[PDB]
């Protein structure tokens, strides 16, 4: 197989365990871990009940949730001191973003006809600049395709690259004269802080994806 | 401390925790605060003695911190009783009241008061 | 507990699925083009 | 609208969520007239 | 960049889209409804 | 040839400067949210869509810029 | 050779122009949030205008990007 | 040839920087429009056409700059 | 010479940078106009002539930068 | 090649510049936090998560600049 | 001919100095409109003060322009 | 030879500019602290930890920039 | 000759950038004068000296830059 | 020779960094004056805070300066 | 030779850029002074030694820029 293939299997087995081997018996009172997956479920439920809130409020709740969860798990596994790439393999993230974007454009055309193009006049403006407001609304509409993907990919990748390059240098930092072994703890503390940050902005990205790909769909479903 | 008042009756309680709805949004006053004169909007008012908080419906008035931490509040009639849907039905009557233009402002106040109940 | 509870997310997510297939083919050509010298 | 009328109207409105006391109702309903006078000459005593 | 040295982009992406389809069905039919069982049961207990 | 490769790697560096502006843009929108909330603690739900919208739109110009850097390096 | 280098350099510098638009957009959206927090109620009139202000801010940055592409492709 | 063509290209890249200021200008006008209208509720009937004028004047500086960029490259 | 002609094209590009300050500047005057007018409801009869004045000189500083761009470009 | 090696170290430095915007960005969000909390005495419970969000996103844009810096610097 | 080339380059760089005055001129007049709208009546006295500041802000950019000319003529 | 050594000394210089941004950010947080504490003289004890956090984070973005300067200088 | 003479002219051009700040500086003080005066009304006779002082110091920065330009020429 | 030219240039570049600190120091002090004028009496608590904020702003200019010196000499 | 002399004149120029920020800083302290004194009518006596301290510190930064310009100018 491929290292990537082995890690896709690992992601699947982790996600299964969050609903089979962390929930004891479907207990009414619930596990201390399971309080989290109630809260996450509810805060994205009540968010897509808010955001979409139609007769399809929650028909896009599985899609917005598996876009949360993919990014949420694959930016923890890749942050471990030894680990390869999942979301740091950009081709899965960029492709997934473009796929969702195409699946919005096609959905909008299918569901809302050629009055899909009423999306690209989102506001009544004076008539000689009505065509202008189609050009740079549709331009801004397929900017959503790459904005969404490139944000996540760059963050995760930049984190791994920062940590590893600095780690190799700080090994050799201790190998200068003995005065560096006095305050030999200080570069270790810097790498620890960077590693902590690299977990944080990735969990932020899983949520930011799932709100942003509610917003683009909000624009597309509810014309204008 | 506070000086919260009402026409027949006055209740107010060192300035260390009052949360006030004021022209500048909502303002919290704790002990010494800079000396201000701010009109209290039609309001939901919280007065905290300690951090224990008692919650008031207030018809708006005026607030004036005197620099000595004396929060002079003068306000009219009041709350959890007054909040407790006929005012909402009255707001719908205020929708028919918008057909008359002071009356527009009155109906607007009714919408504001309904909003204030929703705030409760 | 887990159980299959049907979700008719078929035509709902029909435009999403079509895009995945197209990209699957196109990335085959892109990957093959990159695997050359 | 004038601010103290605005606050007043709010007090009157407050006599409607629901639930109330007599003192409120008296304090908000007690309206009368007001003899519009003029420089001797006196226009009508239109509502307070 | 240590990840453009691969030309295994399609291999990777193939395993990627397979994981997505697997999880989507799995959540939607199994695990999301297993949370909805907890919720409905909690409301029924609240009722009785 | 050396000139071409030199210029390629330099050109990547130059484009990267554009990102700083968009980053400031995001921060400003979240600061605005904070000010709105403190001034009316019930404004928040109406404001929340507009805030996320402004963050994204600010960010987008910078991400166009980042693609030029990558076009220069890889292309 | 020198022509190839020149388009790469020129492309970099032109790309920097996008920076101003990112700030511009945020000033409009900030003013929107501030305006709506000021009024509680301005948004209906203001919201079309706010999307316009954003659009115009974006458009200038897009001119900057377009010069970069006119160099590189052209 | 390569140097002259380069000098055009370099000049074009540099010229594009100027466009940013007029752009920021448009945002400032629209921000003020929002702020003013939120303050007054009703200034808008004068202020909306006034705002379009303000946009045009701030923008114009950018357009002069853009003209020069096209003159260097195409002209 | 080639070198001198190169410097004309490159130098023209640099000149265009000067305009940006005027672009932001003009907008600041219009922001103040709208702010002032929303504050007063009625300041405008005196103030609109003032706003045109502030625009004009702010623009002129930009125009000085612009003419140097043309001068270098043409030679 | 001496030119190319010089190009690597230079291009790195240029990319580093992008970080500055994020640094200011962090502060702007935190300044808003401080102002709001002072107003209410009590907005802080809600506002502290919002403050962290504004910082994190602004920081991310900066980090993209840092990663180009390290790609050129090291590589 | 490098020196002649250099005169033309130096002129270009000089334009950057003017920009600061361009923002500045507007800031003084902005303040004028804000102050005047707050006060009404301050204006007749304030107008001599305003003109002084306006001119002063301009002059710094003017110095930058003069240096452009000094380079050009030699 | 000369090109590579030169690049270290130049490149270090270029990096140093970025650090200025972090400096400005720290000041913005402190400004907010002073104004905030003035407006409610009881907010100080809550706000002073928050202020130090905003300083620390703002400084850090500058620090990463400055690290690249010394890395170019001595690598 | 050529490189050095060229360099003198270039260095001078770069120097103009320092002056811009003084221009902005002066503007900030005068903006403040008007803001202050609009805030107090009657502060002006005392405040006008303060405004002039802040102006002078801001301007002075531009003057120093100008003199460096003259040296390079 | 080229290396000696490069030393002097490298130093120059670093000097630009000082500008941020110059603005910065002022911003802290501006808040001090506003805070003091607002409270009449916040000064004694605020003064160590103000000194700290100043110090950090100035320091950023100094660090920039120290890279200049390293480059100036070598 | 030519390069070193060139570098000295250039290096002086680059350093001159540093001064601008200090200039703007001095203005900012004075702006606060005017606003405070106009606000209070009478804060001035307490404020004057503090204000002078802030001005001086802001000014000093620009002075540092100037001496590096001379060091490079003279070489």
Curated annotation (Swiss-Prot), chain A:
Tell me a GO biological process for this protein.
proton motive force-driven ATP synthesis
UniProt xrefs under InterPro entries: ATP_synth_F0_asu, ATP_synth_F0_asu_AS, ATP_synth_F0_asu_bact/mt, F0_ATP_A_sf
Q: Which GO terms of the cellular component aspect does the record hold?
A: mitochondrial inner membrane; mitochondrion; proton-transporting ATP synthase complex
| Ranges annotated as spanning the membrane | 1-21, 57-77, 90-110, 115-135, 156-176, 181-201
Q: Which UniProt keywords apply?
A: ATP synthesis, CF(0), Hydrogen ion transport, Ion transport, Membrane, Mitochondrion, Mitochondrion inner membrane, Transmembrane, Transmembrane helix, Transport
GO terms (molecular function) for this protein are: proton transmembrane transporter activity
Segments forming a coiled coil: none
Which Gene3D superfamilies does this one have? ATP synthase, F0 complex, subunit A
Q: Where in the cell is it found?
A: Mitochondrion inner membrane
Query: Per UniProt, what is the membrane topology?
Result: Multi-pass membrane protein
Mainly localized where?
Answer: mitochondrion
Give the record's family classification.
Belongs to the ATPase A chain family.
NCBIfam families under this entry? ATP_synt_6_or_A (TIGR01131)
Q: How does it assemble?
A: F-type ATPases have 2 components, CF(1) - the catalytic core - and CF(0) - the membrane proton channel. In yeast, the dimeric form of ATP synthase consists of 17 polypeptides: alpha, beta, gamma, delta, epsilon, 4 (B), 5 (OSCP), 6 (A), 8, 9 (C), d, E (Tim11), f, g, h, i/j and k.
- Quote the protein name from its UniProt record: ATP synthase subunit a
Q: What species does this protein belong to? A: Saccharomyces cerevisiae (strain ATCC 204508 / S288c) (Baker's yeast)
Q: In the record, what lineage is assigned to the organism producing the protein?
A: Eukaryota, Fungi, Dikarya, Ascomycota, Saccharomycotina
From Swiss-Prot, chain B:
Q: Which terms under GO biological process does the entry name?
A: proton motive force-driven ATP synthesis
Specify whether Nucleotide-binding is a keyword of the entry: no
| Subcellular location(s) per record | Mitochondrion; Mitochondrion inner membrane
**What's one GO MF term for it?**
proton-transporting ATP synthase activity, rotational mechanism
Keywords, in A-Z order: ATP synthesis, CF(1), Hydrogen ion transport, Ion transport, Membrane, Mitochondrion, Mitochondrion inner membrane, Transit peptide, Transport
Quote the subunit structure annotation. Answer: F-type ATPases have 2 components, CF(1) - the catalytic core - and CF(0) - the membrane proton channel. CF(1) has five subunits: alpha(3), beta(3), gamma(1), delta(1), epsilon(1). CF(0) has three main subunits: a, b and c.
Q: What is this protein called in UniProt?
A: ATP synthase subunit delta, mitochondrial
The species is Saccharomyces cerevisiae (strain ATCC 204508 / S288c) (Baker's yeast)
UniProtKB/Swiss-Prot annotation, chain E:
Biological process (GO), any one: proton motive force-driven ATP synthesis
Subcellular locations according to the entry: Mitochondrion membrane
* GO terms of molecular function: proton transmembrane transporter activity
- GO cellular component, as recorded: mitochondrial inner membrane; mitochondrion; proton-transporting ATP synthase complex
Q: What gene is this protein translated from? A: ATP8
Going by the UniProt record, its keywords in alphabetical order are: ATP synthesis, CF(0), Hydrogen ion transport, Ion transport, Membrane, Mitochondrion, Transmembrane, Transmembrane helix, Transport
What's the domain of life for this entry? Eukaryota
PANTHER family from the UniProt entry: ATP SYNTHASE PROTEIN 8
Q: State the Pfam families in the record.
A: Fun_ATP-synt_8
Q: What is this protein called?
A: ATP synthase protein 8
Q: How does it assemble?
A: F-type ATPases have 2 components, CF(1) - the catalytic core - and CF(0) - the membrane proton channel. In yeast, the dimeric form of ATP synthase consists of 17 polypeptides: alpha, beta, gamma, delta, epsilon, 4 (B), 5 (OSCP), 6 (A), 8, 9 (C), d, E (Tim11), f, g, h, i/j and k.
User: Transmembrane residues, as ranges?
Assistant: 13-32
Q: How does it sit in the membrane?
A: Single-pass membrane protein
Question: What family is this?
Answer: Belongs to the ATPase protein 8 family.
Q: What is its main location?
A: mitochondrion
Curated annotation (Swiss-Prot), chains F, H, I, J, L, O:
GO CC terms of this entry: cytosol; mitochondrial inner membrane; mitochondrial intermembrane space; mitochondrion; proton-transporting ATP synthase complex; proton-transporting two-sector ATPase complex, proton-transporting domain
Q: What is this protein called?
A: ATP synthase subunit 9, mitochondrial
- State which residue ranges cross the membrane: 14-34, 52-72
What's this protein's function?
Answer: Mitochondrial membrane ATP synthase (F(1)F(0) ATP synthase or Complex V) produces ATP from ADP in the presence of a proton gradient across the membrane which is generated by electron transport complexes of the respiratory chain. F-type ATPases consist of two structural domains, F(1) - containing the extramembraneous catalytic core and F(0) - containing the membrane proton channel, linked together by a central stalk and a peripheral stalk. During catalysis, ATP synthesis in the catalytic domain of F(1) is coupled via a rotary mechanism of the central stalk subunits to proton translocation.
The places in or outside the cell where this protein is found are: Mitochondrion membrane
Database matches in Gene3D superfamilies: F1F0 ATP synthase subunit C (1.20.20.10)
In this chain, where does the modification N-formylmethionine occur? 1
Q: SUPFAM superfamilies from the entry?
A: F1F0 ATP synthase subunit C
């Amino acid at each position: 197989l491929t290292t990537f293939s082995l890690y896709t299997i690992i992601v699947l087995l982790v996600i299964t365990s969050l609903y089979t081997l962390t929930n004891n018996n479907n207990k009414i009172i619930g596990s201390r871990w399971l309080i989290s997956q109630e809260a996450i479920y509810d805060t994205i439920m009540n968010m897509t009940k808010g955001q979409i809130g139609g007769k399809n409020w929650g028909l896009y709740f599985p899609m917005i949730f598996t876009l949360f969860m993919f990014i949420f798990i694959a930016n923890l596994i890749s942050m471990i001191p030894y680990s390869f790439a999942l979301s740091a393999h950009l081709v899965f993230i960029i492709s997934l973003s473009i796929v969702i974007w195409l699946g919005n454009t096609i959905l909008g055309l299918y569901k809302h006809g050629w009055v899909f193009f009423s999306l690209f006049v989102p506001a009544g403006t004076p008539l000689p600049l009505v065509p202008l407001l189609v050009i740079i609304e549709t331009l801004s509409y397929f900017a959503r395709a790459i904005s969404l993907g490139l944000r996540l990919g760059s963050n995760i990748l930049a984190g791994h690259l920062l940590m590893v390059i600095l780690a190799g240098l700080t090994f050799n930092f201790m190998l200068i004269n003995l005065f560096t072994l006095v305050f030999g703890f200080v570069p270790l503390a810097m790498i620890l802080a960077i590693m902590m940050l690299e977990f944080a902005i990735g969990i932020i990205q899983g949520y930011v994806w799932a709100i942003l790909t509610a917003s683009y769909l909000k624009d597309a479903v509810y014309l204008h | 401390k506070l000086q919260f008042a009402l026409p027949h009756e006055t209740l107010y309680s060192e300035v260390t925790q009052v949360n006030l709805p004021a022209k500048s949004g909502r303002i919290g006053v704790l002990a010494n605060h800079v000396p201000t004169v701010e009109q209290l909007l039609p309001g939901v008012v919280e007065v905290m003695e300690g951090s224990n908080s008692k919650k008031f419906f207030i018809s708006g008035g005026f607030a004036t911190v005197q620099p000595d931490s004396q929060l002079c509040v003068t306000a009219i009639e009041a709350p959890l009783e007054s909040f407790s849907e006929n005012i909402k039905n009255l707001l719908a009557e205020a929708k028919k009241n918008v057909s008359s233009s002071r009356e527009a402002a009155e109906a607007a106040i009714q919408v504001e008061v309904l909003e204030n109940l929703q705030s409760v | 507990m887990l159980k299959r509870f049907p979700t008719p997310i078929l035509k709902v997510y029909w435009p999403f699925f079509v895009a995945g297939a197209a990209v699957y083919y196109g990335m085959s050509k892109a990957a093959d083009l990159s695997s050359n010298t | 609208i004038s601010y103290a009328a605005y606050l007043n109207v709010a007090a009157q409105a407050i006599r409607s969520t629901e639930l109330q006391t007599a003192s409120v109702l008296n304090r908000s309903q007690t309206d009368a007239f007001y003899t519009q006078y003029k420089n001797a000459s006196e226009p009508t005593p239109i509502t307070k | 960049m240590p990840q453009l040295v691969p030309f295994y982009f399609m291999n990777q992406l193939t395993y990627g889209f397979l994981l997505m389809i697997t999880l989507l069905i799995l959540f939607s039919q199994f695990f999301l409804p297993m949370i909805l069982r907890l919720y409905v049961s909690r409301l029924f207990i609240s009722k009785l | 040839m050396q000139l071409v490769l030199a210029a390629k790697y330099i050109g990547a560096g130059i484009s990267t400067i554009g990102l700083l502006g968009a980053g400031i843009g995001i921060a400003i929108v979240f600061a605005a949210l904070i000010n709105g909330v403190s001034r009316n603690p019930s404004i928040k739900d109406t404001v929340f869509p507009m805030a996320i919208l402004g963050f994204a739109l600010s960010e987008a110009t910078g991400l166009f810029c980042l693609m030029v850097s990558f076009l220069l390096l890889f292309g």
